[PDB]
Amino acid sequence: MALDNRHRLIVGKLAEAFGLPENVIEKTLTQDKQAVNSFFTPAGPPSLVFVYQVKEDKLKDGSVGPVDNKPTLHRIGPHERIHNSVYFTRLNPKGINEKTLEADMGSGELSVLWALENFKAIVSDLYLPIMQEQQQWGKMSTEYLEDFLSSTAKFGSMLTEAVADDDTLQEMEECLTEWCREAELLLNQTNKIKDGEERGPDTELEYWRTRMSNFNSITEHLKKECKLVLGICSHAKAYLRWRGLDVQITDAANESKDNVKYLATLEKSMEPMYQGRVTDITESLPALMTNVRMMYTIATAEHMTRLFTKITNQLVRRCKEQIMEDKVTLIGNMKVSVELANVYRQQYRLAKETLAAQPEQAIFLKFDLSSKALHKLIDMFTTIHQFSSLEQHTHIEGLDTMLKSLNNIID
Amino acid sequence: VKDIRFDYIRDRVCSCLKVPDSAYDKLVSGDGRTSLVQFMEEAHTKRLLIMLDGKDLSATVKPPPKFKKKTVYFLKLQETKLDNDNIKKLVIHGEISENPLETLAAISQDVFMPVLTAPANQQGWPDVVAKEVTENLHKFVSNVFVTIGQMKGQDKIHILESAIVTWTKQIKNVLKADLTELNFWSERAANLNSIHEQLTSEKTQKVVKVLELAKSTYYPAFQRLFREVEAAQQEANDNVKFLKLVDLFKPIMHTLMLIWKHSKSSSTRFVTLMQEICNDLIMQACKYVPSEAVDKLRMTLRVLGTFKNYYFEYRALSMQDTKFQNNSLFARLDSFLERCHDMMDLMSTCMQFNRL
């Protein structure tokens, strides 16, 4: 409830961090003391953030600074390139003077570098154990929190992805040729992604995400701006090429955005089969065809080829791995896997029946070779296990070397 | 040199721990400053915790539940502390508060929506990614709001997206919310009333009408889910108002028959399962009771049991005057009765063969 005591506590802490000892730190926290009272005790402000910019040394020395720059003891703690913050958001509904200031007001000390590193550090990296320790310390609310921190991880992924006259004629040639060639390159990303490998369908989503990130980077890079103004001056060599590339970039960007958001809708029902159990995919497949069937009521060859070949690649990967880690277990797993392939083909043929009703090369090749190399081996093990009941009646006087014939046949 | 980093971290620790003493030598002189120097001189080392228990310090990672603790986090952005370029501007110099979840809620709703707003205003993300970061920061807000407390007690389209996504999630939370029996139904009444005026309040009403400037599909679904809320709320209230050495306390059992007399003059399955709860209390008492006295105490035990089954048939006859439940009480109570008939007649044989 005491404005001045917490004012001088934040003066001392912002001096110990910043180096502005007494004069303008205390003057700026003193100035407009109605709001300084109206954050601490009263309603309205839930923090009073002193941000301090710099204009001469780019704040690199950090030991101390003049106040020629404009510091803002403003309500918002903004994230620009230039000002180091202190928020002192208070963890008390009413400002109580008796409670100390450094046990509820967290300091706002911020690296002068931009929005990549500090925020992912403060969200994902630093806070790893306490919730987990609180996971250890008695909660039922364990569910959906692990994937909540996987959402923090994908924040980290996307911020790492995204944040990372003769003289005039010379400048025009110097900044055009390079960037036009790069744009022409980036309009060929659909071609270097058709290759021979058992690849997984999430790499599709990641390829489209890289297309998004590079499109955003180039379109921001063009929006250096003096060279655009130089282009406007120099329309009276690349400007035919620039309007052509602009039309190409707009069409590519629009189809990329539509593809990314619709391919993003698919993820929560294709997700169980990447790492789960072999029987789970059987139940997942009706949901999977509800998703795919609704999405082809909208938008073709690239979707069909990449989606179906890679998803069937992943089914082969999961079945073959989950079998490889004896007899009754193996025969059971082969029965389960053949039933999985059968229900997949059955539901795709039902899908083709519906697709014909209302208004498959990869499947053929991949599951036909898998199912034939499973029928042969499942019949071999059924025969072996049917001959395996012989294996312990060794005292009958006519089953001694007979089993060694069976042993050679096995071996 | 390591000395500029050492004295910088020392002056920061004297700033943030605020205990004037030579205690820096009393704790750090063991594993402390060696762990600090190996933290600063090794690759991949990205975190450090220091806890201030009021006056005490601990350089660690594991947070204890001791009150008045304070948290400071140290991270070198670089793998070493560089002699050339200054280390005073350390990328992570964090001081925090005792309770973590309150701070995450406060940081979500106070200090880091600027990261959502102003970098969106400046370069980098004018695309669908701005809509994405707004929506899942709203998800952050909703989650940190609900998982605390509930455990313990062109513009038009995107604004519609936010103000419909938060109710998709909150309805998932609501449908999750639809003496074990007594406390179960008391909790159900209390929680469902509390959510029922979390849904009929002012700002929710304005949100429903602002959304009803679109009138597309979702709002009949929230109408039907409110229809789910109200009847269960009132009926839970009704049965909560209804629900409000054993040799000395058989007259209490008359009260029990009278409760069944008075209540049923609800639904049958919870009635039978309440009878199961009564029988598990009775088995609790009949283990609380425990070679010639043993027959006497088991005679008392069967005597209480036959008052119990006699009150059952009294309730049956008075029901006739004013069918599966017999089989259920038979299952539980008769399993017990034959456990201790076996042991009681075993001790009867044991006494008779103690006469040799």
Side-chain angles (χ1 to χ4, degrees), chain A residues 2 12 15 17 19 21 35 42-46 62 65-66 71 77-78 93 95 103 106 108 115-266 268-411, chain B residues 20 23 30 32 43 54 59 63-65 94 100-356:
Chain A
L116 190 153
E117 188 170 358
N118 52 4
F119 309 137
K120 55 93 181 183
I122 212 70
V123 169
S124 310
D125 298 357
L126 162 53
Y127 306 163
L128 80 168
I130 181 68
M131 64 294 287
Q132 264 187 357
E133 190 197 64
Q134 191 59 255
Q135 292 295 109
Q136 296 153 250
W137 296 6
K139 305 202 300 288
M140 172 36 48
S141 63
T142 62
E143 75 275 15
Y144 193 76
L145 267 290
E146 316 100 341
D147 52 63
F148 172 76
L149 281 295
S150 73
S151 281
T152 63
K154 70 93 176 178
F155 282 122
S157 295
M158 53 85 57
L159 57 83
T160 48
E161 182 71 25
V163 177
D165 191 1
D166 63 329
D167 298 343
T168 69
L169 237 292
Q170 289 161 28
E171 199 50 60
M172 287 142 54
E173 92 231 353
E174 288 161 20
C175 279
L176 287 164
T177 50
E178 293 155 327
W179 305 348
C180 281
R181 289 298 104 78
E182 187 262 3
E184 284 161 338
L185 187 153
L186 204 66
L187 292 169
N188 318 127
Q189 288 286 101
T190 185
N191 311 120
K192 292 180 301 170
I193 55 163
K194 203 170 280 276
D195 283 310
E197 209 267 319
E198 276 79 342
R199 63 215 165 195
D202 71 322
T203 74
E204 196 264 9
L205 213 59
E206 198 78 0
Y207 152 83
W208 284 89
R209 264 281 311 261
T210 51
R211 268 271 284 274
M212 297 335 287
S213 195
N214 296 15
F215 268 28
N216 207 356
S217 284
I218 181 64
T219 44
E220 170 50 51
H221 167 52
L222 184 67
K223 283 160 201 144
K224 298 292 182 74
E225 294 172 349
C226 300
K227 318 173 183 190
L228 187 153
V229 193
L230 183 56
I232 311 162
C233 295
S234 55
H235 298 317
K237 41 177 180 297
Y239 313 126
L240 294 152
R241 292 193 292 115
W242 258 102
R243 79 210 80 156
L245 291 187
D246 276 327
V247 179
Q248 269 174 45
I249 276 175
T250 61
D251 286 314
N254 197 319
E255 204 71 15
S256 71
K257 271 177 295 285
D258 281 331
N259 278 298
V260 169
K261 58 96 172 182
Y262 277 173
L263 285 158
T265 57
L266 271 295
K268 298 181 163 184
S269 74
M270 69 200 174
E271 69 95 15
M273 57 66 68
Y274 280 81
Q275 85 279 39
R277 294 299 293 158
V278 62
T279 303
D280 291 331
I281 321 179
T282 62
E283 273 76 10
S284 77
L285 286 184
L288 203 64
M289 299 315 79
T290 51
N291 278 177
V292 166
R293 181 178 64 252
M294 299 314 79
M295 299 325 195
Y296 286 52
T297 43
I298 297 162
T300 78
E302 81 279 27
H303 307 98
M304 278 212 166
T305 49
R306 293 217 191 278
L307 274 172
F308 284 1
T309 289
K310 303 166 49 201
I311 188 180
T312 55
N313 273 317
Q314 185 58 24
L315 291 179
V316 175
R317 289 167 64 90
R318 287 311 298 162
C319 294
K320 173 213 175 59
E321 183 265 336
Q322 80 95 11
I323 280 181
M324 270 311 324
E325 285 91 356
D326 293 334
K327 300 316 168 270
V328 165
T329 54
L330 288 187
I331 297 173
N333 282 4
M334 299 201 192
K335 276 191 303 300
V336 171
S337 58
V338 175
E339 180 56 32
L340 187 63
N342 198 333
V343 74
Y344 185 89
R345 254 162 179 151
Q346 162 61 244
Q347 192 173 184
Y348 277 56
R349 262 49 163 193
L350 162 65
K352 267 186 168 174
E353 283 178 22
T354 50
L355 174 140
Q358 291 105 31
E360 266 196 12
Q361 315 174 359
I363 296 89
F364 289 143
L365 71 87
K366 180 190 281 311
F367 283 170
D368 264 337
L369 273 296
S370 198
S371 297
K372 296 304 105 173
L374 284 198
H375 275 94
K376 293 170 205 157
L377 183 62
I378 199 170
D379 264 335
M380 210 185 62
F381 281 171
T382 52
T383 51
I384 291 156
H385 184 249
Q386 262 190 349
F387 279 57
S388 73
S389 56
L390 183 63
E391 287 165 339
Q392 70 275 62
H393 312 336
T394 62
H395 65 279
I396 290 175
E397 286 185 346
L399 296 175
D400 291 333
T401 82
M402 190 67 204
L403 272 172
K404 281 164 195 175
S405 159
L406 182 56
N407 181 272
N408 298 2
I409 278 173
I410 283 295
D411 207 355
Chain B
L101 298 97
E102 296 176 353
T103 61
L104 270 297
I107 286 158
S108 77
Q109 57 84 240
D110 188 16
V111 296
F112 280 163
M113 81 292 277
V115 176
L116 194 68
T117 56
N121 295 356
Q122 63 87 30
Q123 75 192 8
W125 306 266
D127 267 353
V128 182
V129 287
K131 296 142 43 164
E132 180 265 330
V133 295
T134 49
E135 287 181 351
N136 54 19
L137 201 40
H138 205 133
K139 292 280 198 69
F140 264 82
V141 178
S142 291
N143 175 39
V144 67
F145 200 85
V146 173
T147 189
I148 79 174
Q150 185 97 357
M151 167 179 180
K152 277 70 51 177
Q154 172 253 306
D155 275 328
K156 315 178 164 192
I157 297 166
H158 310 336
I159 295 165
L160 283 167
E161 288 180 359
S162 163
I164 289 161
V165 159
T166 188
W167 292 97
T168 62
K169 205 52 92 181
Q170 189 188 170
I171 292 300
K172 304 320 188 45
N173 199 82
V174 174
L175 267 192
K176 184 64 67 68
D178 264 359
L179 305 175
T180 55
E181 197 277 346
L182 283 72
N183 287 345
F184 191 85
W185 269 38
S186 81
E187 187 277 331
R188 176 169 213 80
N191 203 10
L192 269 294
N193 284 261
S194 174
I195 311 288
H196 179 268
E197 286 83 5
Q198 197 193 280
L199 65 89
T200 43
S201 79
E202 56 86 19
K203 176 72 144 180
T204 79
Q205 269 161 337
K206 264 74 72 181
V207 169
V208 173
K209 275 75 77 182
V210 170
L211 294 174
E212 273 151 351
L213 278 77
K215 298 297 290 294
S216 68
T217 59
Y218 275 72
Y219 316 134
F222 315 100
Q223 287 164 6
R224 155 180 56 52
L225 297 168
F226 297 152
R227 291 188 275 270
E228 280 189 352
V229 188
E230 181 65 27
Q233 173 203 16
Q234 49 82 11
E235 172 48 0
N237 304 343
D238 275 3
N239 285 131
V240 167
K241 92 182 173 67
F242 279 177
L243 272 295
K244 71 179 309 174
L245 288 73
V246 189
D247 194 16
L248 195 59
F249 300 140
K250 66 186 71 62
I252 298 171
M253 299 177 221
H254 296 89
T255 297
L256 269 53
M257 88 199 170
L258 288 154
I259 289 176
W260 280 35
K261 273 192 189 200
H262 292 171
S263 81
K264 202 178 283 285
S265 50
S266 55
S267 43
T268 65
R269 179 185 158 145
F270 318 100
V271 169
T272 68
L273 285 174
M274 186 65 204
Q275 189 39 60
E276 189 81 19
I277 300 153
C278 296
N279 296 12
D280 218 334
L281 182 63
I282 291 160
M283 182 289 262
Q284 183 179 2
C286 294
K287 182 60 68 71
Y288 186 116
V289 180
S291 67
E292 296 199 9
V294 294
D295 166 82
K296 185 186 40 72
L297 57 84
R298 290 175 189 167
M299 195 39 165
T300 60
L301 193 153
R302 262 69 188 173
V303 175
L304 320 169
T306 186
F307 290 106
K308 268 302 285 156
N309 216 320
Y310 207 89
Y311 293 150
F312 290 111
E313 312 302 332
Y314 181 76
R315 276 169 292 198
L317 62 84
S318 45
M319 183 177 176
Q320 297 328 287
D321 291 331
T322 46
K323 285 204 77 171
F324 306 159
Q325 55 272 17
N326 313 330
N327 314 119
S328 80
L329 64 89
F330 284 161
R332 177 56 146 193
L333 205 59
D334 298 358
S335 67
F336 166 68
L337 287 184
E338 312 312 344
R339 296 158 74 102
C340 281
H341 268 171
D342 287 351
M343 193 58 71
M344 183 277 287
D345 279 353
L346 187 66
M347 295 296 172
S348 284
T349 64
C350 289
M351 83 204 299
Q352 305 192 10
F353 275 48
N354 288 125
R355 285 151 41 141
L356 278 70

Short mmCIF file of all heavy atoms in Angstrom, two decimals, chain B residues 1 12 22 64 77 96 115 160 180 196 206 208 225 245 255 261 276-277 286 294 301 307 310 316-317 328 343 346, unseen atoms left out:
data_model
loop_
_atom_site.label_atom_id
_atom_site.label_comp_id
_atom_site.label_asym_id
_atom_site.label_seq_id
_atom_site.Cartn_x
_atom_site.Cartn_y
_atom_site.Cartn_z
N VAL B 1 37.92 -13.49 -19.02
CA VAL B 1 38.20 -14.03 -17.69
C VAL B 1 36.91 -14.49 -17.02
O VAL B 1 35.83 -14.01 -17.35
CB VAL B 1 38.93 -13.00 -16.82
N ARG B 12 24.74 -9.56 -8.58
CA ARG B 12 23.34 -9.85 -8.87
C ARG B 12 22.72 -10.67 -7.75
O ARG B 12 21.56 -10.45 -7.39
CB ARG B 12 23.23 -10.58 -10.21
N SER B 22 28.19 -12.90 4.98
CA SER B 22 29.22 -13.65 4.28
C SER B 22 28.75 -15.05 3.88
O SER B 22 29.58 -15.93 3.65
CB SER B 22 30.48 -13.75 5.13
N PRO B 64 11.61 -26.73 -3.54
CA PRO B 64 10.94 -27.32 -2.38
C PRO B 64 9.65 -26.58 -2.08
O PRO B 64 9.42 -25.48 -2.60
CB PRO B 64 11.96 -27.14 -1.25
N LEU B 77 23.81 -17.13 -22.60
CA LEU B 77 23.42 -17.32 -23.99
C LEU B 77 24.56 -17.93 -24.80
O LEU B 77 24.31 -18.66 -25.77
CB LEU B 77 22.98 -16.00 -24.61
N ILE B 96 12.24 -14.46 -9.70
CA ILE B 96 10.81 -14.79 -9.75
C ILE B 96 10.12 -14.76 -8.39
O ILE B 96 10.54 -14.06 -7.47
CB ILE B 96 10.61 -16.16 -10.42
N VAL B 115 4.23 -9.28 -26.70
CA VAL B 115 4.90 -10.14 -27.68
C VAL B 115 3.92 -10.57 -28.76
O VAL B 115 4.28 -10.73 -29.93
CB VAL B 115 5.55 -11.34 -26.95
CG1 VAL B 115 6.18 -12.32 -27.93
CG2 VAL B 115 6.57 -10.86 -25.94
N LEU B 160 -14.55 -14.01 -34.52
CA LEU B 160 -15.48 -15.12 -34.36
C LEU B 160 -14.74 -16.43 -34.11
O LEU B 160 -15.19 -17.27 -33.33
CB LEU B 160 -16.38 -15.23 -35.58
CG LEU B 160 -17.52 -14.22 -35.70
CD1 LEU B 160 -18.09 -14.25 -37.09
CD2 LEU B 160 -18.59 -14.53 -34.68
N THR B 180 -18.60 -42.11 -0.46
CA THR B 180 -18.39 -41.71 -1.85
C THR B 180 -19.65 -41.16 -2.50
O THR B 180 -19.59 -40.19 -3.25
CB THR B 180 -17.83 -42.88 -2.67
OG1 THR B 180 -18.70 -44.01 -2.55
CG2 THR B 180 -16.44 -43.25 -2.20
N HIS B 196 -22.97 -23.20 -13.82
CA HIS B 196 -24.22 -22.70 -14.39
C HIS B 196 -24.34 -21.19 -14.30
O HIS B 196 -24.94 -20.56 -15.18
CB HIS B 196 -25.41 -23.36 -13.71
CG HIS B 196 -26.73 -22.87 -14.24
ND1 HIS B 196 -27.41 -21.82 -13.67
CD2 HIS B 196 -27.46 -23.26 -15.31
CE1 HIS B 196 -28.52 -21.59 -14.36
NE2 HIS B 196 -28.57 -22.46 -15.35
N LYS B 206 -23.02 -11.38 -23.19
CA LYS B 206 -22.59 -10.51 -24.28
C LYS B 206 -21.81 -11.28 -25.33
O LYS B 206 -21.94 -10.98 -26.52
CB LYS B 206 -21.77 -9.33 -23.75
CG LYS B 206 -22.58 -8.06 -23.54
CD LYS B 206 -23.48 -8.13 -22.33
CE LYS B 206 -22.67 -8.04 -21.06
NZ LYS B 206 -23.55 -8.12 -19.87
N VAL B 208 -22.29 -14.48 -26.16
CA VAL B 208 -23.28 -15.22 -26.93
C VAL B 208 -24.02 -14.31 -27.91
O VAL B 208 -24.23 -14.68 -29.07
CB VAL B 208 -24.26 -15.95 -25.98
CG1 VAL B 208 -25.39 -16.59 -26.75
CG2 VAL B 208 -23.53 -17.02 -25.21
N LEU B 225 -26.54 -27.74 -24.93
CA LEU B 225 -25.69 -28.06 -23.79
C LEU B 225 -26.12 -27.30 -22.54
O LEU B 225 -25.98 -27.83 -21.43
CB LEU B 225 -24.24 -27.83 -24.16
CG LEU B 225 -24.00 -28.83 -25.30
CD1 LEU B 225 -22.71 -28.60 -26.03
CD2 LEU B 225 -24.06 -30.26 -24.80
N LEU B 245 -20.07 -51.52 19.87
CA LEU B 245 -20.72 -50.23 20.07
C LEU B 245 -21.97 -50.11 19.20
O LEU B 245 -22.89 -49.36 19.52
CB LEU B 245 -19.77 -49.08 19.73
CG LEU B 245 -18.58 -48.68 20.61
CD1 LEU B 245 -17.43 -49.68 20.55
CD2 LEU B 245 -18.09 -47.30 20.20
N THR B 255 -33.76 -45.47 11.57
CA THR B 255 -33.66 -44.20 10.85
C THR B 255 -33.35 -44.47 9.39
O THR B 255 -33.99 -43.88 8.50
CB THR B 255 -32.54 -43.35 11.47
OG1 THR B 255 -32.86 -43.03 12.84
CG2 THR B 255 -32.20 -42.10 10.64
N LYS B 261 -37.87 -45.25 3.67
CA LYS B 261 -39.30 -45.01 3.70
C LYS B 261 -39.61 -43.60 3.19
O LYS B 261 -40.47 -43.42 2.33
CB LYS B 261 -39.83 -45.22 5.11
CG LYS B 261 -40.19 -46.65 5.41
CD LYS B 261 -40.99 -46.78 6.69
CE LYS B 261 -41.15 -48.23 7.08
NZ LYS B 261 -42.27 -48.44 8.03
N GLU B 276 -25.08 -51.33 -1.00
CA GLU B 276 -23.72 -51.86 -1.05
C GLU B 276 -22.77 -51.08 -0.14
O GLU B 276 -21.89 -51.66 0.50
CB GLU B 276 -23.21 -51.85 -2.48
CG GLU B 276 -21.90 -52.56 -2.71
CD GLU B 276 -22.08 -54.04 -2.86
OE1 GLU B 276 -23.22 -54.47 -3.14
OE2 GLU B 276 -21.09 -54.78 -2.73
N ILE B 277 -22.93 -49.75 -0.10
CA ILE B 277 -22.12 -48.92 0.80
C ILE B 277 -22.42 -49.25 2.26
O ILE B 277 -21.51 -49.32 3.10
CB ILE B 277 -22.34 -47.42 0.50
CG1 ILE B 277 -21.95 -47.10 -0.95
CG2 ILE B 277 -21.51 -46.53 1.43
CD1 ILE B 277 -22.69 -45.92 -1.51
N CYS B 286 -17.50 -55.24 11.31
CA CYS B 286 -17.31 -56.64 11.68
C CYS B 286 -15.88 -57.13 11.50
O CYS B 286 -15.59 -58.27 11.87
CB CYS B 286 -18.27 -57.52 10.88
SG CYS B 286 -20.02 -57.25 11.26
N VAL B 294 -14.47 -66.25 21.70
CA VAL B 294 -14.63 -65.97 20.28
C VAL B 294 -16.03 -66.35 19.81
O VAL B 294 -16.64 -65.64 19.01
CB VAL B 294 -13.52 -66.67 19.48
CG1 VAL B 294 -12.19 -66.08 19.83
CG2 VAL B 294 -13.47 -68.13 19.82
N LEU B 301 -22.03 -60.88 16.78
CA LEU B 301 -21.84 -60.42 15.41
C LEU B 301 -22.98 -60.91 14.51
O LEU B 301 -23.57 -60.12 13.75
CB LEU B 301 -20.48 -60.92 14.94
CG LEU B 301 -19.77 -60.43 13.70
CD1 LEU B 301 -18.29 -60.61 13.92
CD2 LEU B 301 -20.22 -61.22 12.52
N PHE B 307 -30.45 -58.76 12.86
CA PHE B 307 -31.24 -57.52 12.82
C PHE B 307 -31.14 -56.82 11.48
O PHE B 307 -32.13 -56.23 11.03
CB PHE B 307 -30.88 -56.53 13.92
CG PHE B 307 -31.28 -56.94 15.28
CD1 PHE B 307 -30.37 -57.38 16.20
CD2 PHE B 307 -32.60 -56.75 15.68
CE1 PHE B 307 -30.78 -57.72 17.47
CE2 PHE B 307 -33.01 -57.09 16.94
CZ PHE B 307 -32.10 -57.57 17.84
N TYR B 310 -33.31 -58.75 9.12
CA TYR B 310 -34.68 -58.62 9.58
C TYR B 310 -35.24 -57.25 9.25
O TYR B 310 -36.41 -57.13 8.90
CB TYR B 310 -34.74 -58.89 11.08
CG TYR B 310 -36.08 -59.40 11.50
CD1 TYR B 310 -36.36 -60.76 11.50
CD2 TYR B 310 -37.08 -58.52 11.87
CE1 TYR B 310 -37.60 -61.22 11.87
CE2 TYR B 310 -38.32 -58.96 12.25
CZ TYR B 310 -38.58 -60.31 12.25
OH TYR B 310 -39.83 -60.75 12.63
N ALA B 316 -39.23 -54.78 3.25
CA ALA B 316 -39.96 -55.44 2.18
C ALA B 316 -41.45 -55.55 2.50
O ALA B 316 -42.30 -55.25 1.65
CB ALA B 316 -39.36 -56.82 1.90
N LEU B 317 -41.79 -55.96 3.73
CA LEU B 317 -43.20 -56.11 4.07
C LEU B 317 -43.90 -54.76 4.13
O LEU B 317 -45.04 -54.63 3.69
CB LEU B 317 -43.36 -56.88 5.38
CG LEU B 317 -42.82 -56.43 6.75
CD1 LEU B 317 -43.74 -55.45 7.48
CD2 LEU B 317 -42.51 -57.63 7.63
N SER B 328 -28.21 -58.93 -4.31
CA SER B 328 -26.99 -58.15 -4.09
C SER B 328 -26.55 -58.19 -2.63
O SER B 328 -25.35 -58.40 -2.32
CB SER B 328 -27.23 -56.71 -4.52
OG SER B 328 -27.93 -56.01 -3.51
N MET B 343 -15.01 -69.73 10.39
CA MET B 343 -14.06 -69.56 11.50
C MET B 343 -14.71 -69.77 12.87
O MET B 343 -14.07 -70.30 13.79
CB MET B 343 -13.39 -68.19 11.41
CG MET B 343 -12.20 -68.07 12.31
SD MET B 343 -11.05 -69.36 11.83
CE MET B 343 -10.47 -68.77 10.24
N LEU B 346 -15.12 -73.43 13.39
CA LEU B 346 -13.77 -73.90 13.65
C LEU B 346 -13.38 -73.73 15.11
O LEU B 346 -12.83 -74.65 15.73
CB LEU B 346 -12.79 -73.16 12.76
CG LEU B 346 -11.42 -73.79 12.92
CD1 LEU B 346 -11.58 -75.13 12.37
CD2 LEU B 346 -10.39 -73.06 12.18
#
